[PDB]
Design a protein around this ligand. Structure first.
Ligand SMILES: NC(=O)C1=CN([C@@H]2O[C@H](COP(=O)(O)OP(=O)(O)OC[C@H]3O[C@@H](n4cnc5c(N)ncnc54)[C@H](OP(=O)(O)O)[C@@H]3O)[C@@H](O)[C@H]2O)C=CC1
Ligand SMILES: CN(Cc1cnc2nc(N)nc(N)c2n1)c1ccc(C(=O)N[C@@H](CCC(=O)O)C(=O)O)cc1
Length: 151
């Protein structure tokens, strides 16, 4: 199983604000869709609420500590470790966020797919700092930009 983090972030690593995104970038969302189509996507409960519904044509997996919580359309796990353990036989697992999930996933991450937006927005949640010496750029396309890093 390859563990991949996919995130859209600005130059300060901002990813969220008041549990929404600080932008709307249609080019990013269609990038996110093709990349995640047909694969297990792992998200936190707050990120699920932000989206508002299961993303179609994907196995939506939500991590919560709420034991009575049921979300229609999605699989619930009570830790990232229970999720990853249940997806052992999968060839790729895609972690979509948010800030808390990214931070816990990062040290297990094999690959990162990052949209870095050239701007500075106001917000309150961030993508965790990664040691640039531990990763290598496998692809860079400057449109914002798409950056693929492999560990
Ligand atoms: N720019 C981007 O690419 C992305 C941005 N975002 C943005 O990020 C923000 C949401 O991120 P954030 O607020 O950090 O919240 P998260 O999306 O990380 O979800 C947090 C919740 O996930 C559950 N959780 C997290 N870790 C664990 C664990 N180890 N075990 C059990 N449960 C766990 C808890 O749920 P519970 O409270 O139910 O117990 C926790 O409250 C929003 O603004 C969203 O729009 C989100 C994804 C991608
Ligand atoms: C809040 N949230 C989390 C979110 C947003 N942008 C991201 N962008 C990137 N690059 N990576 C992420 N993990 C990411 N996550 C969202 C919000 C909406 C949709 C969404 O409606 N996407 C649909 C449709 C997108 C479209 O309109 O084409 C899809 O099928 O992927 C996805 C994630």
């Amino acid at each position: 199983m390859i563990i991949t983090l996919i995130a859209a972030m600005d130059k300060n690593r901002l990813i969220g604000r008041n549990n929404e995104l600080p932008w709307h970038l249609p080019a990013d969302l269609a990038h996110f869709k093709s990349i995640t189509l047909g694969k297990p996507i792992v998200m936190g409960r707050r990120t699920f609420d932000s989206i508002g519904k299961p993303l179609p044509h994907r196995r939506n997996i939500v991590i919560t500590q709420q034991k009575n919580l049921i979300i229609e359309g999605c699989d619930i796990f009570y830790s990232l470790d229970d999720a990853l353990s249940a997806l052992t036989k999968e060839p790729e697992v895609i972690i979509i966020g948010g800030a808390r999930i990214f931070k816990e996933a990062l040290p297990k991450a094999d690959k990162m797919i990052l949209t870095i937006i050239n701007h500075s927005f106001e917000g309150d949640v961030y993508f965790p700092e990664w040691n640039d010496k531990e990763w290598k750029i496998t692809s860079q396309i400057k449109h914002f930009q798409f950056l693929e890093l492999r560990r």
